[PDB]
Design a protein around this motif. Sequence first.
Motif, PDB file in Angstrom:
ATOM      1  N   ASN A   1     -17.809 -44.888  -5.436  1.00  0.00           N
ATOM      2  CA  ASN A   1     -18.209 -45.109  -6.818  1.00  0.00           C
ATOM      3  C   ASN A   1     -16.946 -45.024  -7.631  1.00  0.00           C
ATOM      4  O   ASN A   1     -16.100 -44.183  -7.361  1.00  0.00           O
TER       5      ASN A   1
ATOM      6  N   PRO B   1     -14.101 -53.759  -6.127  1.00  0.00           N
ATOM      7  CA  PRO B   1     -13.317 -54.860  -5.584  1.00  0.00           C
ATOM      8  C   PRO B   1     -13.325 -56.066  -6.530  1.00  0.00           C
ATOM      9  O   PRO B   1     -14.353 -56.344  -7.181  1.00  0.00           O
TER      10      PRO B   1
ATOM     11  N   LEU C   1     -23.019 -54.095 -15.160  1.00  0.00           N
ATOM     12  CA  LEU C   1     -21.636 -54.019 -14.619  1.00  0.00           C
ATOM     13  C   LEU C   1     -21.147 -52.590 -14.311  1.00  0.00           C
ATOM     14  O   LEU C   1     -20.272 -52.382 -13.446  1.00  0.00           O
TER      15      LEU C   1
ATOM     16  N   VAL D   1     -21.265 -47.989  -7.999  1.00  0.00           N
ATOM     17  CA  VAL D   1     -20.643 -48.803  -7.023  1.00  0.00           C
ATOM     18  C   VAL D   1     -20.841 -48.181  -5.669  1.00  0.00           C
ATOM     19  O   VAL D   1     -20.273 -47.157  -5.378  1.00  0.00           O
ATOM     20  N   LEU D   2     -21.671 -48.842  -4.877  1.00  0.00           N
ATOM     21  CA  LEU D   2     -21.953 -48.408  -3.527  1.00  0.00           C
ATOM     22  C   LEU D   2     -20.928 -48.935  -2.518  1.00  0.00           C
ATOM     23  O   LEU D   2     -20.290 -49.967  -2.738  1.00  0.00           O
TER      24      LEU D   2
ATOM     25  N   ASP E   1     -20.117 -50.942   0.591  1.00  0.00           N
ATOM     26  CA  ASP E   1     -20.751 -52.227   0.851  1.00  0.00           C
ATOM     27  C   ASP E   1     -21.541 -52.184   2.150  1.00  0.00           C
ATOM     28  O   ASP E   1     -22.440 -52.991   2.336  1.00  0.00           O
TER      29      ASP E   1
ATOM     30  N   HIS F   1     -16.945 -64.910  -3.426  1.00  0.00           N
ATOM     31  CA  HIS F   1     -16.478 -63.839  -4.276  1.00  0.00           C
ATOM     32  C   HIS F   1     -15.237 -64.211  -5.033  1.00  0.00           C
ATOM     33  O   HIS F   1     -14.217 -63.522  -4.968  1.00  0.00           O
TER      34      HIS F   1
ATOM     35  N   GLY G   1     -16.326 -64.394 -11.957  1.00  0.00           N
ATOM     36  CA  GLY G   1     -15.843 -63.805 -10.712  1.00  0.00           C
ATOM     37  C   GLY G   1     -16.663 -64.068  -9.461  1.00  0.00           C
ATOM     38  O   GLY G   1     -16.215 -63.731  -8.364  1.00  0.00           O
TER      39      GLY G   1
ATOM     40  N   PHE H   1     -15.176 -60.183   3.869  1.00  0.00           N
ATOM     41  CA  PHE H   1     -14.273 -59.261   3.208  1.00  0.00           C
ATOM     42  C   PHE H   1     -15.095 -58.545   2.163  1.00  0.00           C
ATOM     43  O   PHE H   1     -16.253 -58.878   1.943  1.00  0.00           O
ATOM     44  N   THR H   2     -14.522 -57.540   1.533  1.00  0.00           N
ATOM     45  CA  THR H   2     -15.314 -56.712   0.601  1.00  0.00           C
ATOM     46  C   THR H   2     -15.875 -57.502  -0.606  1.00  0.00           C
ATOM     47  O   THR H   2     -15.101 -58.057  -1.414  1.00  0.00           O
ATOM     48  N   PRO H   3     -17.221 -57.518  -0.753  1.00  0.00           N
ATOM     49  CA  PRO H   3     -17.794 -58.236  -1.865  1.00  0.00           C
ATOM     50  C   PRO H   3     -17.480 -57.558  -3.193  1.00  0.00           C
ATOM     51  O   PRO H   3     -17.141 -56.380  -3.229  1.00  0.00           O
ATOM     52  N   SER H   4     -17.529 -58.320  -4.278  1.00  0.00           N
ATOM     53  CA  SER H   4     -17.288 -57.746  -5.587  1.00  0.00           C
ATOM     54  C   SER H   4     -18.495 -56.976  -6.062  1.00  0.00           C
ATOM     55  O   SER H   4     -19.390 -57.517  -6.737  1.00  0.00           O
ATOM     56  N   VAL H   5     -18.518 -55.693  -5.729  1.00  0.00           N
ATOM     57  CA  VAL H   5     -19.723 -54.886  -5.928  1.00  0.00           C
ATOM     58  C   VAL H   5     -20.222 -54.873  -7.388  1.00  0.00           C
ATOM     59  O   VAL H   5     -21.414 -55.035  -7.627  1.00  0.00           O
ATOM     60  N   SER H   6     -19.324 -54.679  -8.353  1.00  0.00           N
ATOM     61  CA  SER H   6     -19.751 -54.617  -9.763  1.00  0.00           C
ATOM     62  C   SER H   6     -20.249 -55.964 -10.247  1.00  0.00           C
ATOM     63  O   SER H   6     -21.227 -56.036 -10.976  1.00  0.00           O
ATOM     64  N   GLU H   7     -19.587 -57.030  -9.821  1.00  0.00           N
ATOM     65  CA  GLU H   7     -20.040 -58.375 -10.197  1.00  0.00           C
ATOM     66  C   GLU H   7     -21.421 -58.666  -9.624  1.00  0.00           C
ATOM     67  O   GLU H   7     -22.220 -59.388 -10.260  1.00  0.00           O
TER      68      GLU H   7
END
Lengths: 392, 392, 392, 392
Positions: free
Chosen positions: A19, A202, B28, B32-33, B35, B65, B203, B246-252
């Motif tokens: 987080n 990210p 937004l 944030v978890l 992934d 992403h 994004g 690859f790491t997704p845009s968690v907040s987006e």
Amino acid sequence: MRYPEHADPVITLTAGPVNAYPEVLRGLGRTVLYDYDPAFQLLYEKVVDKAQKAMRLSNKPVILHGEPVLGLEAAAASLISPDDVVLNLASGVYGKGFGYWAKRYSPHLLEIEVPYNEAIDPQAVADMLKAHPEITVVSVCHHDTPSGTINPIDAIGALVSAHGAYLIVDAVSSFGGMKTHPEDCKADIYVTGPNKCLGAPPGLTMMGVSERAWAKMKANPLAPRASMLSIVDWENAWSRDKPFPFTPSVSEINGLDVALDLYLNEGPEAVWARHALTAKAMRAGVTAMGLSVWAASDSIASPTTTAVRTPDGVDEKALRQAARARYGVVFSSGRGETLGKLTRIGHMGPTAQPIYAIAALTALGGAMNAAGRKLAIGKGIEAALAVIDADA
Amino acid sequence: MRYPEHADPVITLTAGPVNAYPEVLRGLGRTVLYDYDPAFQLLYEKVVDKAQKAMRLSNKPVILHGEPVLGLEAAAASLISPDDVVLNLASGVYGKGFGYWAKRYSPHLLEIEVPYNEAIDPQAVADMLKAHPEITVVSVCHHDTPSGTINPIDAIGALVSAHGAYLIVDAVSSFGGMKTHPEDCKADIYVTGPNKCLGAPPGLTMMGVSERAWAKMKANPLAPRASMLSIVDWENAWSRDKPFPFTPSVSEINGLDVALDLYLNEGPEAVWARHALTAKAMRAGVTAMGLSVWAASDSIASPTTTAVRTPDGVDEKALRQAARARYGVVFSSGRGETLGKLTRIGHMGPTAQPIYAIAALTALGGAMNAAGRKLAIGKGIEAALAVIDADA
Amino acid sequence: MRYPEHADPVITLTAGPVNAYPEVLRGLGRTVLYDYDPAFQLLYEKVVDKAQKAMRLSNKPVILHGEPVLGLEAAAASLISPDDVVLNLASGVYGKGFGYWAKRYSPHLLEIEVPYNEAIDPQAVADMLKAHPEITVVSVCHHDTPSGTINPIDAIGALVSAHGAYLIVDAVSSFGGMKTHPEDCKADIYVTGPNKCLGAPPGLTMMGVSERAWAKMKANPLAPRASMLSIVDWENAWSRDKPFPFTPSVSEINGLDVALDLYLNEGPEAVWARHALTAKAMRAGVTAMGLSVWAASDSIASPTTTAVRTPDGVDEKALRQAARARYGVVFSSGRGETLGKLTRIGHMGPTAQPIYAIAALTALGGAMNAAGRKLAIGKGIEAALAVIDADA
Amino acid sequence: MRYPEHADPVITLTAGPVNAYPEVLRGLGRTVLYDYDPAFQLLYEKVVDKAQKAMRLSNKPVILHGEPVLGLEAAAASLISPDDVVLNLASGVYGKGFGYWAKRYSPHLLEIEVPYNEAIDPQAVADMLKAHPEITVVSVCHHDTPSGTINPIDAIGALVSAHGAYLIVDAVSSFGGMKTHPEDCKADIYVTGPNKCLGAPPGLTMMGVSERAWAKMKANPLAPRASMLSIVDWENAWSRDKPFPFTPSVSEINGLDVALDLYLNEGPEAVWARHALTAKAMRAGVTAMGLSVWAASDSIASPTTTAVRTPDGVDEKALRQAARARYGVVFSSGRGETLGKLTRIGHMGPTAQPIYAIAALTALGGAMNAAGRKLAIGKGIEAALAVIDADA
């Protein structure tokens, strides 16, 4: 009680994403401006300035608008020409992985590979460079995160420079959690992002680029241009008086602005010290309860992630599931070769506080003992606390 | 009074970015978890399902992403190979621009081009396809934002399907703000994003991919793999039981979850109606005060952006600067070959409410009369308000 | 199209609450600390300091933890003793209303009351004070908001001081939107809050208290103590080294911290000027379209709210309903005696931008004409815009 | 390392305020509507309905717009008149404190008092009521937070009802964290708030009021009217068709809406279970390391706060200061007659998760051993974890 899988956990103690800092979560909700609004153009310029200061950089870092795998692929695509001879260093999943991108842009690939709990010996690098004077580009991963180990990139970088070669560094999971900067290792391309130790989500890349690397990429007709993979197109985009190649991730920029504020305001040295102390406490607790740290020696163990070897007969996936379902605490699996063989506890940004090592150790111990181990959990907490108190 | 350039504006009435919906700004800042946390895996799958529902898709849309230029470049890179003959349709900046990526991936490029205030004529498209059986891929932009004009992509898609060719559609600035969906126009690749009418920041990319496109892309040795530019890597990533490339845009993703909820809960048809009404009111006011809508005809004018022709002699840049300094209202410049030719007022998601047409009309008229024009501003407001009041 | 009553409006242009500044909305979501946490104790002290600076105060303002009706009742309960002779000034609903509280704490009440669209004549105050030398306390409302009119409190305050009497001021709806400070009017108790021009939600009181008033209240054995109505209990609570009488509204404090930052950073003079210009433009537009400003003369009209007299035969409630349902724009009703007789457009904090006067005028005109009026709406917009351009 | 006093802590583990649920922090930043906007009127009514459901109430609870000391004082001021004989029950700071307000509103005060680690004995209450038929009002505190102890208010409420007297219950720090509701204890006035177990900030009061209390309060000439202290003014304010006595705290209502949603969606019983489990784990760990729970017996110890007796000789203030400076963990001091006697660890809403008991145990034990104690910290962690692991 049990925590269901569909609902939020209590504490995420992974090797990233974790987080984000609460200030960053709020920053992500800042006003989204038009990217050609004069106020956003000023903001963007200022965020580049903050990144430069944080990275101790003599020139402007480049912000790229994808998560750091973009910077890594783009560095390969731009810095490695077909006539380059690349020496890739592999001590883990990411280091080995980078060799595939190098192989994409040049057919000439030399590699030094060590077991995935050890670090690259700078002397092996020196030996290889002597044996292969034709080497022009060297690539290295600082913290090969799925292993929780650190390579001596500063000593490696001095050698690479000694042999007139270019250095690419992956510092995604190390910058901001320990003393490390593009200058420190003489990097030509130094790739990081705010989505590990800087405690943002990210979405963005922060790339240090040497004047020598600028010259090389600009003279490379194969360097991506009019492309998501382009570094050179972004060369002047920091400036309030210049256009953006494509629309920047405005909300991620607002989050980065805050992440950098927090880091600079806390004081980078204080930030590194709390990461290192949290990991130190964790490793002491791990050893004291009867588990083993993955890294072959304590000296190469990451201050930003502790990897714990899975005991024989223990299902590592069921272990992580049990830690979350019983205690609300989330850890990372390994990746590639380390998947199934270790569990990872991150110490990154907002999770880099020694009390979270205590929470991690208890959840880890608890889940181990649920799996039939007989760990001395109390002794573990006491050893971690002794580490914390010794520093007080 | 004057609004400082460094200070935030009052209303951003551009063709994107605009300020995100307030709910999206809060979305937004959700947790944030990790992934690979089961709650995130489940969220991600249910966001793809929401996108699938919103796009009226028979199969899963792919979320990529990066902001939708990534989708456009990836679509070219993956679908077009040197055996293809591409017909690119260009009625503006983005349509013309897609041909440059087409030409990067096949040397065979046919084009139908019209001036940047017109739309592509479907009869011209039918004639071209008949004359060239060798065409295998057709590219088209639905709303070529820098001109505020619309192409008849449904009729075009049908012609292209009868031909036997693949259709690539750029619907970035139309989806969510008017009736359009991948299976309306028989799109093989349909690229959109939530960063225009859906009222989220830049994004992410939302891409509809036909089963035939999947087969073509997956067969192509030159299609990006292990790359930011890879569509094929992301095929199974919707599933909670699958990894992310690859790491997704968690907040987006959090922002997108909210944006989809808003759109689906309001009702897509109702959302399209208020974009159309806002735009209709805008055009009526522009005409009544003594200005000209850029579009060659009213029938092709976009319901999500009104482009207003700069009077000959007026400095368009100074005009936009004046609208912000005097009234705190921000408009978009044109782009490429429309830069200097027109001013753009977006009607997109949160700004698609008829009262914002009134504000825009007054700021634009106000700026114009400060540049020495003699517009009938009151007449313009009254004509826009008649359109609002007439709405049955 | 119509906006349903259950869903959010597009623009709230009321005399308060209005939507808070977006920075304040985010500030409300700041970390909630324990009120005895040393970091919160420091914060609270700092917020009192910011309030002192904003209020131009020689001593500490008191923050009370209820919306400003708390400060008003508490000022009466603490400053008015049973042997005091109170002169209440009433030019509207709130001024008249305060006399009821005065009557609660002293049986001796004199009043000057004028019609509810006029202001108090300082000369009438001078005359009354001469006629009644026994007067010890004088109470006045600066902006009697349901009327959109201003009393000359500085000239009144100089007279009150000349006669050795104590002054209570209600500046809830004026402080921050015009030049006004406890010192300016020689106030003994000056009550305001951040929930009008400062663009924060209701919840807190900001009270200037003269050293003379401190002495009086402290010597009053009837002044509330161990009570939500206590001012004296809060005397030292600003200090990081002192307790809070009861738990402060931690989130409202975080919002106030931000509200004050915005005001101080923009520059109070610039803030007052934009309120006054927005109201000036509004009044010009109102008059030009054929409606009347409520206030008996333009010179007493509030820069923070415009009240518009309802034409005969026009249902004021249906009018407001129509402005919201047709255009998404919310206005305030009157209150008490002005309910049904006028409509109120606030110009407060984030709504104090001239473009919002344009939006207000259009919605007001539109709804009037829907009710069968025949307003020259265009002429109204042009007159408001001429006001804005004249100031440019 | 050390945590600066000016800097934010890592974990706030106090008995309130604690940090609000993350959802509530975002809820606090929702759109601030005009309080007479139909969407707000509807929201407000549906928030009262949510509170009604959560409190299992047969009639509407009253929301008052101050933190719950307002409810307590208002309940005294409105219900107790000089004809009443009040029996106040005091087992701690808040119970004793209520008698002082009781004595302000009637000179006839009877009390049952026990030391501040005990609970009121229902047999003592029955005996007192029998001996004093003249008693008309009884006051009681459910969880007297500064002692972390619970009174048997249901048995007491029944005795009081049989007597024929009115019951006033303070359930501020118990409601939402254990089974308790106005009609469980036959409360005439039941005061709670969302600022403890419901995980919202301070600033609102939720009050259950019996029909009999309504009649008594509305009859009483001394009950506050046109006052912040007025319950009676707010009787009909729940209704979308009714006015508010003064401006409601719009942002706090937004936070409360979210807090109620969280509680109702999780399921009250499940919420009470995790507070109880967290507390049970805490007490077990405290005892095992060598400390004493303050409560005279385990059976009266609160599931929402564990008070831990300061070892004789230990400086309790320095201890709390040490827990924050060393570990970043914040505890509550005692209050009034418990100040210096005990340390308090809250288990409230977001902090009612067993892993936080582990963190608290380690910080408290850590601080204690730094003060020279020789606690068995590991033993304590293992005993708390056994309780977690045992939970059926």
